[PDB]
Design a protein around this ligand. Structure first.
Ligand code: CHL
Ligand code: CLA
Ligand code: CLA
Ligand code: CLA
Ligand code: CLA
Ligand code: CLA
Ligand code: CLA
Ligand SMILES: CCCCCCCCCCCCCCCC(=O)OC[C@H](CO[C@@H]1O[C@H](CS(=O)(=O)O)[C@@H](O)[C@H](O)[C@H]1O)OC(=O)CCCCCCCCCCCCCCC
Ligand SMILES: CCCCCCCCCCCCCCCC(=O)OC[C@H](COP(=O)(O)OC[C@@H](O)CO)OC(=O)CCCCCCCCCCCCCCC
Ligand SMILES: CC(/C=C/C=C(C)/C=C/[C@@]12O[C@]1(C)C[C@@H](O)CC2(C)C)=C\C=C\C=C(C)\C=C\C=C(C)\C=C\[C@@]12O[C@]1(C)C[C@@H](O)CC2(C)C
Lengths: 93, 677, 212, 150, 145
């Protein structure tokens, strides 16, 4: 592993060169354990007290889990107050 | 040698596990790891102490034995990569390793108390330890792959440290500009190492040194490709060492902490570019024109870094431009081909201005009790005034630092700048006398900084200036039980109650009844004067004083590691000339040592302020507008990209999404027409 | 914040269920009531014995460090021929007798300043004064100071002061016993401490003191 | 947000690139960024094990058995190597782990955050799917507001 | 052949009349596309030393379930050695030419046998060929140094 390098410029070099590679099997092994960690984490952290998607801040206002519950909320609750306003005018407010 | 270089791979990885534990601690269990608040501090300090002792041991073996170790391992072996991540122990590795570790340990001892009143504590030390990890991996690097790797990681850590105080948006602009500028240098380092791989096919620091002895003698390679490759390879050190094109990231780094001013510069990270150029000098002396380019960029930025620090209101920005001008001195030394004096000037500046930044932050933390918390108040060098009477050890440390930059031979650092100008004047006459002129300017602004900070009255508790101070000192009036039972609501006393009548004038009285209702007395009366900081601030300043006194006298170790009186007295004369010009302008009359006849004649010769009214205007507008280069880069480089981004999303959304949407629009239209035909 | 609050009377003792003596109320760190003989009866002498324990433990800690860490470096391949109980007989400069008198001079200065602290607390004060800055009056054995508390961990920053002093004293009692083990088992085995550890860890049953 | 009334339009769209943050004239340093908060003496202990178990106990829905098997699952793979090399046994064991976890996650509480936002009107505790198998309470049509008060 | 992007066959560089091939075919460790640089004859002489030391210090790579990376590392570094010996014998001094090209032939047949040993996942033949290929790599390094 010892190589003495002769370069005229600065100094001599004592390069080691430990050529190595994670065994072919060990790459499958680290994939195996990481799929195990993914499995464990999916199960356990799905079984966790998820503090944002439980409260009346999210599930109360809208909160179906989509990305449009805000927009259908602010597009339907004004129609809800227009409906309530018409039903108010139906009894002469 | 037999068993100590095989375990040289740990000196990047030893700081690493405490940012690993903080990065999984603060991100997962913030109350837990913040309950262990001061323990990760001492753990980072202890791991950096291990790296310090091991780097000192490697330095002792480098000064004893002349050898280089290149303990390379394998990283990827699939095809032409065969990549390595090994650790290259030259004397430059030893210099850079002790330069990282000692400054990092002292900044961590400082930062235990700098951040001790900060809610953001452990993520700062995670950034610190990961930065020390990255920079020690950068200096122990056997190939341009790993230099590139830890180079960009150092740039990321610069982004994180400058945008540490993330809640203030000027630090947000600062850290974005910083990381983008570091990526403009990263750009050049990329197509510079790829150009070297096209010219060599090396990707190793070993084989470049034995290919560039005969690569230029070949016919396939072009000299134009080699010089543009070396210039792009130099674009990286421009961004790290804050050279003239890519310098606009450095003075905005002030909005983060003062330890990152002591560590991002005057230290490791601006020494990354110096390390890179000095490591690649065996392939920079070979390419003929790049040496002149490095000399040119250095000699352009030394006039920029000098003239910028002349009129800074901020202490931290002024010391930043001082750091940038000394880094320009280092690049001017690297353009000399000086393999020795460049690194020695790097050592003495990186131990001098680091002390200067810690003294500045001690000044700042003393001023925090006066002005509260504000950088336009607690970092404004104008209203610092004088702190010799209050914080004496800070005064001595800051003074030894500023004399270490002003070039004082016996009790400060001068031999570095002596070697700079000695290697400068026998090189080219254009570059030399302007370098000595910038040295005189450097002594001028550094002594200006020292006089505005420590010498004179305070400028903030001064009874001519602060009205709350005059209201607080005089709890009772000058007559006691006369003239008032105290008077509040002092009316418009233009006549001063003298019943003065008026001659021909515009008006004397009117319908204007405005009473100057002043504030009261005997309330928050104390106004606690700036006392000394604790032991964790003085102790790195004492150790850095011991450094800058110890390095400042270094039958010498100039050759085994890697005009005498006239030039020395000329440099001391132009430096003391800068001392004298700053001294007659800023040192007040009651404490100056000069004769009052000459002191009276200074203002008697210069009471006009007409031939000064343009000079002071031009210098202040230069140092305030940053040579207009900040405004030009924010006008035609980043807002040019903003206009290009808006034009390009116009072309996207309107006239290539327009075609795709228009296919369906046309199908709707032909359907509606052919329905009704 | 910085008061050196003692341990409660219902503290853990060296011998559970036993009565702690009346001269070990808990003012000192590491107070677990260890007094089968009662050598700390006189409190004016128990102060001196507390200082004795503190300095003894600090020296034993630095010493056990200087024995085991450099032996780990020797096993790693840094230092040659290391053996702490033969590291005084081996060669240096200055003959080991000029070293001794220079040591006695310098340590005489240091330990004499410490003695002057012990006899009269404010005599040899350090951590120099600053304007409108009141350096706190320290205790004997815990001077604080810019030189010995530069991280300001003594006044109770990371943890309280009592638990930190108890950490010092307990870690250091353990180090005192470790050094006694060094001084005994390096002469009844004529071998290395780390070698003795690996030898006992090889076979804990038969590689004990009774083999020799 | 909610915005039961219609919101005020921003008359000043501050900039397409710069942030929505206040400027330096109104930025009180130290008390905003936290750079000069943390005056200690008000923080508490629970050092690194009285605050890990506090956090794990803060966010957890697991009983004694499930959770003990979760804590012993990853060491059962970390001992799958370095102690043996069983092969398919790890995968079959983790498959049965996931099957028994999903069977355990047919929990007795049904927790109305698991239901539709159309369920949220009022008195939803009297809705009891937690005990009533094959409910047949036709309310999920979601087209007209049902009074399910029985 | 319009300057940028020569197109079609994408050739490999040829052999300049050398007997450096197998002669029952060219060679079995030829990696298809690698960038050997036109540095110069001393540069090729040094890179022979460098890659010969690489295949020398391939010690810690050889082992069970690692033979494929041994084969890829062999093909890579031996392709570098192949083009560098092609340039060295192509710029030889007409008396150093024949013994060095015979040395290259008896090195490359050894590389062929080691590549076939590591290709069939047989560790005993891999090590039994790696012994005298370590001998010949030390021989070619001390020739080039
Ligand atoms: C303070 C504790 C101290 C202890 C526990 C020892 C312990 C020892 N010394 Mg020692 N020394 C100590 C202080 C000093 N020694 C020496 C100089 C020597 C010498 C010259 C020798 C010892 C030897 C010894 C050993 C005697 C048996 C033993 C290991 C002897 C030895 O190593 O033989 C086994 C021996 O020759 N010591 C000096 C002067 C620098 C000391 C200064 O404090
Ligand atoms: C330099 C040695 C030394 C000294 C002076 C002290 C002093 C003190 N200790 Mg500490 N202690 C020590 C070593 C020492 N300790 C060690 C090594 C241990 C661990 C074994 C302890 C464990 C300990 C506990 C758990 C407690 C104390 C306590 C005390 C206090 C009351 C006891 C007293 O006055 O004894 C004075 C002691 C001496 C003058 C030294 C004894 C010298 C004689 C000649 C006997 C030496 C021979 C010895 C038995 C050999 C060991 C044989 C081996 C097989 C074990 C006092 C401050 C109590 C306290 O309040 O804490 C502050 C308490 O609760 N100590
Ligand atoms: C109790 C404090 C103490 C004392 C008295 C000594 C005393 C000694 N040490 Mg130790 N050492 C200590 C603490 C101490 N060390 C610590 C805390 C570390 C870490 C070391 C690390 C250390 C090394 C690495 C070496 C010594 C060596 C030495 C010897 C020469 C020192 C001179 O030069 C001397 C016997 C040197 C020696 O000659 O040992 C054989 C040596 O190589 N020491
Ligand atoms: C007759 C002259 C005389 C003598 C015999 C001493 C003797 C001593 N001095 Mg004193 N001293 C003297 C004059 C003298 N001094 C004078 C004139 C001054 C200036 C005021 C001092 C100021 C002084 C200080 C400040 C200290 C000593 C200390 C010491 C002790 C050094 C310990 C040792 O042996 O280290 C070898 C020793 C007892 C040190 C000590 O341990 O004090 C208790 C210490 O800190 N001396
Ligand atoms: C690990 C054992 C240990 C521990 C927990 C302490 C703990 C303490 N010491 Mg003691 N001390 C020790 C060993 C120890 N010391 C030794 C071996 C020496 C001799 C050099 C001293 C000398 C000493 C002095 C002179 C002073 C203290 C002070 C202090 C306090 C603040 C510093 C601190 O927290 O240290 C933390 C320690 C560590 C994190 C250990 C790792 C350090 C590595 C090896 C570097 C605290 C009560 C100061 C004090 O109480 O001021 C009021 C004070 O003045 N100690
Ligand atoms: C079991 C157990 C438990 C729960 C503790 C618990 C504790 N120890 Mg103890 N300790 C134990 C065993 C244990 N220790 C043993 C077997 C040793 C070896 C002799 C020690 C040595 C030891 C030292 C040296 C120190 C502790 C400290 C703390 C904290 C209450 C530390 C502490 O917090 O002191 C206040 C401290 O300094 N312990
Ligand atoms: C904590 C200190 C400590 C430790 C870890 C060891 C460890 C060891 N000793 Mg040492 N030893 C010690 C103190 C210590 N000893 C003391 C104080 C003495 C003087 C009486 C000796 C005298 C001694 C001799 C003469 C010999 C050993 C030997 C050994 C080894 C085999 C055990 C034998 O049993 C004998 C152990 C004793 C007589 C010591 C009694 C117990 C002490 C007081 C420790 C008390 C418990 C401690 C507080 C907690 C344990 C540590 C904790 C972190 C778990 C082992 C590596 C043998 C060896 O090297 O063979 C390979 C051997 O020949 N020891
Ligand atoms: C390496 C392993 C990383 C796996 C991911 C861990 C993680 O995401 O969970 C974070 C949680 C804690 O959540 C915590 O819960 C806390 C809730 S509370 O404030 O205490 O109430 C809170 O600190 C925060 O939300 C969160 O960090 O911790 C775990 O459950 C990890 C289990 C042990 C591993
Ligand atoms: C084929 C032509 C597409 C015709 C159908 C058509 O006109 O597109 C229909 C679609 C928009 O029509 P929709 O009715 O889907 O509009 C969305 C509405 O559902 C709600 O806004 O247009 C595009 O998405 C352009 C499609 C590009 C297709 C390429
Ligand atoms: C100070 C100390 C050690 C200092 C060591 C030093 C400087 C070592 C230096 C070196 O090694 C190095 C570094 C490197 C080597 O190359 C050179 C030397 C020179 C060899 C040990 C104390 C060691 C001290 C010990 C072991 C003391 C034990 C005391 C006990 C057990 C007391 C018990 C009791 O007193 C109580 C507590 C209460 C009573 O009521 C009951 C009883 C039972 C009486």
């Amino acid at each position: 592993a010892v190589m003495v390098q002769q370069i005229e410029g600065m100094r001599d070099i004592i390069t080691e060169k430990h050529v190595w590679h994670l065994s072919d099997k060990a790459i499958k092994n680290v994939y195996m354990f990481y799929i195990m960690f993914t499995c464990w984490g999916c199960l356990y952290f799905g079984s966790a007290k998820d503090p944002f998607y439980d409260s009346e801040e999210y599930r109360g206002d809208g909160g179906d889990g989509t990305g449009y519950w805000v927009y259908e909320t602010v597009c339907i609750s004004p129609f809800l107050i227009l409906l309530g306003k018409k039903e108010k005018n139906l009894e002469m407010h | 040698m037999e068993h100590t270089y095989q375990y040289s791979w740990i000196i990047p990885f030893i700081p690493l596990p405490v940012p690993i534990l903080l990065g999984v601690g603060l991100l997962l269990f913030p109350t837990a790891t913040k309950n262990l608040r001061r323990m990760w501090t001492f753990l980072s300090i202890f791991l950096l102490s291990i790296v310090m002792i091991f780097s000192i041991y490697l330095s002792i073996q480098q000064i004893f034995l002349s050898c280089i170790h290149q303990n390379v391992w394998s990283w990827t072996i699939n095809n032409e990569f065969s990549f390595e991540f090994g650790y290259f122990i030259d004397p430059l590795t030893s210099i850079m390793s002790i330069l990282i570790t000692t400054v990092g340990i002292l900044v961590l001892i400082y930062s235990d108390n700098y951040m001790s009143h900060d809610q953001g504590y452990l993520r700062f030390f995670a950034y610190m330890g990961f930065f020390n990890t990255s920079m020690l991996g950068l200096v122990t690097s056997s190939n341009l792959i790993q230099v590139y790797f830890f180079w960009e990681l150092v740039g990321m850590c610069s982004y994180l440290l400058i945008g540490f105080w993330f809640t203030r948006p000027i630090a947000a602009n600062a850290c974005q500009k910083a990381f983008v500028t570091n990526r403009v240098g990263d750009f050049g380092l990329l197509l510079g190492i790829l150009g070297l791989y096209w010219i060599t096919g090396s990707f190793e620091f070993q084989d470049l040194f034995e290919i560039f002895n005969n690569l230029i003698l070949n016919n396939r390679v072009n000299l134009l490709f080699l010089t543009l490759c070396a210039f792009l390879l130099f674009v990286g050190p421009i961004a790290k060492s804050a050279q003239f094109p890519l310098h606009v990231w450095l003075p905005d780094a002030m909005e983060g902490p003062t330890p990152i001013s002591a560590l991002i510069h005057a230290a490791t990270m601006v020494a990354a570019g110096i390390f890179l150029v000095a490591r690649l000098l065996p392939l920079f002396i070979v390419i003929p024109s790049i040496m002149y380019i490095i000399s040119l960029i250095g000699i352009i930025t030394v006039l920029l870094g000098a003239t910028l620090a002349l009129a800074q209101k901020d202490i931290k920005r002024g010391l930043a431009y001082s750091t940038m001008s000394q880094l320009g001195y280092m690049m001017l030394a690297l353009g000399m081909g000086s393999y020795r004096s460049a690194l020695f000037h790097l050592i003495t500046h990186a131990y001098s201005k680091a002390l200067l930044f810690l003294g500045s932050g001690s000044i700042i933390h003393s001023m925090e009790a006066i002005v509260g918390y504000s950088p336009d108040k607690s970092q404004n060098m104008i209203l610092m005034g004088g702190l010799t009477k209050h914080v004496p050890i800070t005064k001595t440390a800051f003074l030894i630092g500023t004399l270490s930059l002003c070039g004082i031979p016996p009790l400060a650092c001068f031999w570095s700048k002596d070697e700079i100008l000695n290697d400068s004047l026998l090189f080219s006459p254009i570059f030399a006398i302007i370098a000595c002129s910038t040295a005189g300017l450097t002594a001028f602004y550094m002594f200006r900084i020292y006089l505005l900070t420590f010498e004179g009255h305070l400028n903030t508790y001064f009874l001519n200036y602060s009205g709350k101070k005059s209201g607080s000192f005089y709890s009772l009036s000058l007559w006691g039980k006369e003239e008032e039972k105290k008077l509040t609501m002092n009316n418009t006393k233009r006549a001063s109650f003298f019943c003065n009548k008026t001659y021909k004038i515009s008006n004397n009285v009117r319908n204007q009844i405005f009473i100057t209702v002043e504030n009261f007395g005997l309330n928050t009366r104390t106004f606690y004067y700036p006392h000394e900081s604790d032991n964790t601030i003085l102790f790195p300043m004492l150790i850095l004083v011991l450094f800058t006194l110890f390095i400042g006298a270094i039958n010498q170790e100039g050759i085994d590691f890697d005009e005498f009186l006239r030039n020395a007295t000329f440099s001391v004369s132009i430096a003391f000339f800068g001392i004298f010009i700053a001294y007659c302008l800023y040192k007040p009359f009651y404490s100056s040592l000069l004769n009052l006849t000459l002191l009276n004649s200074f203002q008697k010769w210069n009471s006009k302020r007409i031939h000064w009214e343009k000079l002071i205007n031009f210098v202040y507008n230069w140092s305030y507008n940053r040579g207009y280069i900040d405004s030009f880069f924010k006008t035609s480089l980043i807002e040019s990209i903003r206009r290009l981004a808006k034009q390009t999303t116009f072309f996207d959304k309107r006239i290539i999404d327009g075609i795709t949407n228009g296919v369906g629009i046309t199908s709707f239209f032909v359907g509606e027409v052919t329905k009704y035909i | 914040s910085s008061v050196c609050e003692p341990l409660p009377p219902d503290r853990p003792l060296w011998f559970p269920g036993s009565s702690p003596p009346e001269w070990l109320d808990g003012s000192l760190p590491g107070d677990f009531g260890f007094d089968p003989l009662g050598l700390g009866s006189d409190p004016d002498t128990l102060k001196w014995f507390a200082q004795a324990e503190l300095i003894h433990s600090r020296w034993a800690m630095l010493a056990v460090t200087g024995i085991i860490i450099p032996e780990c470096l020797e096993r790693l391949g840094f230092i040659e021929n290391f053996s702490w109980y033969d590291a005084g007989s081996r060669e240096y400069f200055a003959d080991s007798t000029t070293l001794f008198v220079a040591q006695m001079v310098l340590m005489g200065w240091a330990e004499g300043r410490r003695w002057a602290d012990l006899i009269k607390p404010g005599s040899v004060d350090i951590e120099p004064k600053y304007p409108h800055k009141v350096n706190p009056k320290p205790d004997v054995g815990y001077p604080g100071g810019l030189w010995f508390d530069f991280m300001m961990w003594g006044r109770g920053s990371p943890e309280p002061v009592m638990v930190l002093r108890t950490k010092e004293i307990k870690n250091g009692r353990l180090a005192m016993l470790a050094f006694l083990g060094f001084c005994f088992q390096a002469t009844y085995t004529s071998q290395d401490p780390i070698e003795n550890l690996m030898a006992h860890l090889a076979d804990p049953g038969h590689c004990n003191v009774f083999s020799a | 947000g909610l915005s039961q009334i219609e919101p005020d339009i921003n008359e000043d769209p501050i900039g397409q690139f710069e942030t929505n943050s206040i400027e330096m004239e109104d930025f009180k340093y130290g008390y905003y960024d936290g750079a000069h908060t943390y005056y200690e003496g008000e923080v508490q202990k629970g050092t690194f094990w009285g605050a890990i178990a506090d956090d794990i106990a803060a966010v957890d829905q697991t009983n004694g058995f499930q959770g003990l098997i979760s804590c012993m699952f990853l060491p059962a793979i970390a001992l799958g190597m370095y102690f043996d090399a069983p092969g398919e046994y790890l995968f079959i064991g983790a498959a049965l782990f996931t099957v028994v976890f999903c069977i355990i996650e047919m929990d007795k509480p049904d927790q109305p955050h698991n239901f539709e936002p159309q369920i949220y009107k009022l008195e939803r505790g009297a809705r009891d799917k937690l005990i009533n198998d094959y409910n047949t309470m036709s309310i999920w049509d979601f087209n007209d507001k049902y009074g399910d008060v029985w | 052949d319009n300057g940028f992007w020569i197109d079609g066959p994408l050739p490999i560089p040829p052999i300049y009349n050398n007997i450096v091939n197998e002669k029952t075919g060219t060679r079995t460790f030829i990696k298809k596309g690698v960038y050997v640089a036109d540095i110069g004859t001393k540069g090729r002489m040094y890179r022979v030393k460098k890659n010969a030391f690489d295949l020398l210090a391939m010690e810690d790579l050889i082992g069970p379930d690692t033979l494929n990376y041994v084969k890829k590392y062999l093909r890579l570094k031996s392709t570098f050695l192949f083009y560098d010996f092609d340039n060295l014998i192509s710029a030889a001094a007409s008396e150093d030419k024949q013994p060095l090209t015979d040395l290259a032939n008896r090195l490359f047949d050894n590389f062929e046998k080691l590549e076939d040993a590591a290709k069939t996942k047989n560790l005993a033949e891999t090590e039994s060929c790696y012994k005298d290929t370590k001998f010949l790599l030390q021989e070619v390094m001390t020739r080039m140094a």
